[PDB]
Amino acid sequence: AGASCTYVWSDWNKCVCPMGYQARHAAVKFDYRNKPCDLPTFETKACSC
C-alpha cells in the first residue's frame, strides 16, 4: 500500500504582496512506528506581485 504519512496538499493561498510568495498546507495523518512523519506539511513559493 505504502500510505503517505501526510494528507494531501491544500490549495495555494493568495499571493502575499509585495514580498511575492504564497503558501499551502498539509497535515500529518500518522507517524511511523519507528520515526515521526517526515513529509512536509508547509510549503512556500514565489509568485508575481
Q: How far apart are CA 17 and CA 35, in angstroms?
A: 38
What is the binding site for other proteins (CB under 8 A)?
7-11, 13, 16, 19, 21, 23, 25, 27-31, 41-42, 44
- Between 9 and 47, CB nearer to other proteins: 9
Q: How far is the CB of 28 from other proteins (least distance, A)?
A: 5
Q: How far is the CB of 29 from other proteins (least distance, A)?
A: 6
